[model samples]
Target: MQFHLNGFRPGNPLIAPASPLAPAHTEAVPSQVDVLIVGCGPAGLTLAAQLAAFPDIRTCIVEQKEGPMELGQADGIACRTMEMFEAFEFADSILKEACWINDVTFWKPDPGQPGRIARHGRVQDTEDGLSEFPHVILNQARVHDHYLERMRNSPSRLEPHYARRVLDVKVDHGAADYPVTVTLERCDAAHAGQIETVQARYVVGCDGARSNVRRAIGRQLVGDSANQAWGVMDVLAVTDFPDVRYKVAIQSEQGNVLIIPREGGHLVRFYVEMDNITVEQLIATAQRVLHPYKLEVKNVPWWSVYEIGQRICAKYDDVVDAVATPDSPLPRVFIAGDACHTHSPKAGQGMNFSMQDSFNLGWKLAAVLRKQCAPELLHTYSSERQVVAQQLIDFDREWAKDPKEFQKYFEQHGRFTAGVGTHYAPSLLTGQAKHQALASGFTVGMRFHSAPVVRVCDAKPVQLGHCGKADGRWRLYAFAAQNDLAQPESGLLALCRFLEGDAASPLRRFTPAGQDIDSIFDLRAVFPQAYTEVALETLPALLLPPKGQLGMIDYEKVFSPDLKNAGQDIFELRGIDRQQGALVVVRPDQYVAQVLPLGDHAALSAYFESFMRA
Candidate 1:
């Protein structure tokens, strides 16, 4: 099972995209905003960009530090996260600079060769068909750079305030409009003590492990700290080790060391566990593990000692606390990222999980702020993320219980770390079903898996992942059954007519006042038949874009099998029957919220009606 690369030297140069945002300033702080995000880490920035996409929602993201992260932290980008980067249209940019890790090698000390470790086994880094993008290695700094660029380029005007630290957060009770009031102080030398007040409808804490906002909301992290500490270093090494280019885990008398090949193969990060370990000791340990093969550190960039621990907040949000004036019962303050959860970086879940927490909350906040959905939707954010945080905590606890359990844990729950296999329980937002016995393997609460489908009009191939962007819109994917327009009873045509027929659709009726139906939902049709078998002209009005919108109906929102390509039968691959198609409702975060029978307009409308305002 071992796959080795002889001369796979990565030559991709890192490109730092220029920031179009104006220099960070605190002089023009707004008195009121729709959302206030504290801490400019991945989670905060992601929330800012996501909220910024909707121009109506004003966002203020503040950071205590003066600039973006510089050192290496949480370098592994899982396959599921890469798909999200693609949704934001920067996957290629990240890929250009990242080292795509295709294989991993595990080594143990050889009894015959003294002081040397031999390869025990090797395997692919990612499971097959998990995603179009593979697992990649790039420093957290670079990842933040991409997010910063995305924020500046987005339609919403949001610039994170650097050197601005939160001083206090107070809740105002009487006003339902904007209940959260946040006070911040400048951290820089020039205006070190200057104070600023911001009134916001909602406040999200993306602050790190020691979060002031989380504390302000009356929440505490509960978990255990590990006695074994690990030292991590980013270095350029001259090594004769065959698997230096691959992510290698070495087991020796001293301890275990995980070697991660960084961007362009010029640098590698070594995380070594040792008692009373130092930079010198870590290097010596790495050299000892590579015994017969010469290993020398040519250049040292950054390193740190990390004391591993796992902890999650007792509660993600403080809805019950009305201490700031007893009459104010609703809690508008929230926490995400490291603020709510903290765990060892061994699993590479730090940054991904943190950003995901915000990803889940961002759109929901936007929906509530825009009044497109009910305020009750905000409660789901805490419930959903707290469960995920707890899962990571439990996984870490299991790993700590026994070192040998690592491989077994990964084998069983590797998909969970990949972010693809994350599943939520039955809720009003999750289609009221924890499990669905559908022909497709698609689960109700899991993210929608990707499949290759073609644009019937242009006959071009495209991955299904590209269709659902993080632009604050719901995706209604109508899996069309085979048979032509003449068969009016077919699920595809029937669903189509119900959505866009001359009679007013339920969508329009369900859309809250002052909101357009399309803004709330994007309807797309996926046919199981070949492109040539379908008639594009007879498609319903909604399948085609409005007048003056020049894109063809098939190109805009419709997908079908390509006559030229094999294995393009997504329906069959998903275990979906051609005669009995299903309608899938995907949330803004790409989770499959609901899967209902095709032509069941009543059920589809009810799904939206559960949380959405009419």
Candidate 2:
């Protein structure tokens, strides 16, 4: 499963059509493929483009729509997701067609009140740290266009066809794998009536909410269904829309309306809630909503009504016994994007979160396909991101109660997407995992950590995934020689052994070189803190004992006193805790899965073994 990925760059653009187009005369089918991805939305396209990074892998994207251009007009791309646009070199061009929203001025009418609350960064920088990716917004169609263009320029990219619809997907289950056979129909072109059969090692369903793939697998999506419907319309106009400055709850005598700013210049988003109104009736309501401002709709772009539902697929359960057969691909057939989790668009996080979900799942899937890392890596995607969706849903609930909370949502001092790294926190699993597994914000896991292949300390860092990968093995990075293990018998040696042994040990141990450990650490500390907020707010409150806080307390009381399953991993970094103990038993993914006192090497070793497997 080793690979050699080369020659793929961000600017290498490609065009793919997601339609059923084939020749009726030819009875051939695509049989030899490595990875087959269904749906060409942001999730599918992003996954395809990412999988194309590996030279040895052959990737195909099955889309049901006409193409990106035809669908571009209606797709809503979040500003945070646009940072990837920069990675693919489309951010600059997309920005040309988008609005540069550096500040979101939340306005309140009262003079004694907080007139305007500005959410500057995408993440709360004070808590976790900061990075260059602020937030940027754009249309989903444009974002799709960029990915399509980038894939077209690549040698190995999305195998797109128009009018191609997946009719039936049957899996041949085996002891260890399940081979997926997909029957597709092409409704466009001369072969419009023809049917095609395709078999692949692994199949990824990136179809939107009403996914046929989920139905084919018989996996049920659990949660709330449309409690309310919201109208989302995009228009090209000019007006003093004060609602853009309003975070939530506009206190109208009629009803409540939400405003989401688009990236393209002069285009604003209006999400209106209505009942008993036809499409025309909603438009009429929109017209009245805009009456307060002198807005002109010279180019009223697109409009649609949608209901938000909070639902998650049962297959995304990490504990689910889904094993892939050897005849099938490594990860077997799986679902992602809205196919995996669908919810109300109340928080305006659907698109960004979906794309980021793909970002987390794609690289790991590719890595597994190449056999670079363990298949256990894929579990992190569902476990980590599912938690994120829950957090987002909760945020939506709170935002429904109070809009000004958006101020608390983004910290001005941190790394906010203003349009970058929207995928940073990912979910509670990885987010909280860092607090436990990683020491001082450093990621301990191979797949979850962000490695900058094109990193410049004094400048912005472009992660390894942004570029192509090398051989299957990932690097075990230790900045400078500062990570060197202390010699035995030294007081520091006890701490080092505790960290390396009790905490999750790296597959490969190595150290980075240089004289600037503190300098690098200080810079690294600049990451946003909002990520931690998610953990603290949604997950259990972690028990971070004082520096030397350790004693001969019972394990159950110390770790899970009330037997509460904290949705976080834990770590025990060597601090000034000689008085408490030396060794610490941390979680696999890492917050503090559990803490162990010094000299309890036997207890520490046993705890780590369980944590690693857990």
Candidate 3:
């Protein structure tokens, strides 16, 4: 929500001003694109919206469908997804209309009773401050709409071309740039016989489980199925089951049911495990599950039958053997969402994983295209995301093995359900945990955990992680030492000086000359005190540097813990060292790349030098 950092020359805040490198018009997809994204689902739209933010990167997204989807195949939005939406600055819009499951009730067959089931537990669905945002249920179609809006609002004014299906893709690594030729068939009646072709530096497949782009990359989904099928329906019903409004699970003589209330009121989704069943049988089975509880159905919104299984693509991109050849040609084609991974009809991670896959690759693509980082950084997208997909498969395999353990299994898997459990092992992007103890809560591989902190400039309460926007900039947070910051030699002050003045500093090394000092990276300072105890202006100017063409000072970078809630202080919540302090390096994708002592300027320099271009 913080704007006007580059001074107040007002216009449409969403549409960035004309930049020298941007295309004049993005109303139509051109023959040449920097990145060609196939399929306009959650994954493709997410990447399209992200690439749109960088006007320099010409991004094109295509979908076989005639237009936007009204009712989508998936609906569960996790806390991690909401956190990502906050970066795009539209989290509240969706939350106002979304459904938040406060708790989940579990039921089992009563030992004494022959035909009825009784509630055994009603544990909280998602709690314990796992995230600043809560897990909510909203349709995936709406999610795609939000990303499409974001794309149009950006400087690029990006839009997806419908009725344009990708038929084939060819990667010519010999060509230095724009070596990928993607053939497309226009399905619109008006353009019935027309075929389109585009040359792109990179191509991404977000086209779903049966993806032509995925096949073109010579990758196939490899996994087995449980051979179990489930009947799912979104319905509006009148039931005296007592927990219809609540997310409830029933283990009955007839079958097992996972009922979740839909986004719009009076509608609930019923998921019952069975096979070769008719629509009428779904209702008949639900009635038996809650025997003696009056049940009447008014309408059925949507329904489908899916078998339980896990399938993952062999490789996410076109690099045949990356590990074997350290000098392999840079990957020209990539796959995400259902293209790379698909699940067993579960609602939790399909769209979330798809969008997250794009989130992981989106920034890396921008950095490499901008020549800010080497193309090798793009390889981590495959290594990092493929593992998270496999972990989900592992979890799914266990959870679907037996319905008797639903309550116990669900209770133990809240972290993964929150979508924050996606972690990347140590790589060039994620540094080794050599100095990790400095800020233990900011795990090197996981998404940067949020904590309560108040901005000193306006005494406004803020979640520290909300400041990391999707503009694709790294965040360097400096936790001040207990020593007096008034002294120039204090750990925080010395680190500031080194980053601001030293040629070897990442801020100077990777950033272009004549741009704002904090343009490439956002530098924020957090003191070990209350907001009232800190003087914003007294801090080093680098923490609140002048921006814009006219040198307007920015004041939103300094912060302190809001001690009003004793349990919410960031230093305690994130386990940051109170006495010596720490420096946490956050990546563009919001994962903690490294954590170092506040005084380890040399290590900080080395971290960026390893991947970023000088």
Report lDDT per candidate: 0.77, 0.48, 0.84
Q: Which candidate number would show the highest lDDT if scored against the true structure?
A: 3
Which candidate achieves the best TM-score against the true structure?
A: 3
TM-score of 3: 0.95
Q: Residue-pair clashes per candidate, as listed?
A: 0, 78, 0
After superposition on all CA atoms, what RMSD does each candidate show versus the true structure? 6.9, 13.2, 2.4
Candidate 2 is scored at a TM of 0.63
Instruction: Put down candidate 3 lDDT per residue, 169-240, tens digits, no spaces.
Output: 998868877999999988889987578899999999999888999999889998886456788888888988
For model 2, how does the per-residue alpha-carbon lDDT over 1-614 read when each residue is reduced to its tens digit?
Answer: 11112223243233222222221212344664667788998788888777655546767788877656543433444444554554455666865666544444332233333322222223122232132243445667777776776666444544476567888777775733326788898877767777888877777788888878777777777888686887767766666665452222332434455566776445677677865545566556655544444555566567777785788775552234543222323346677888878766555455766776676677667656655445656666665666656655665555554355455654321222221322324322222332332234343221222323222222323342222122122221222111112223432234334434443332111112321111111101111111222121221111111111122111110111111223221121112122232222212111122222333445434532321322
Better of 1 and 3 by lDDT: 3
Model 1 CA lDDT for position 495: 78
Model 2 whole-model lDDT (C-alpha atoms): 0.48
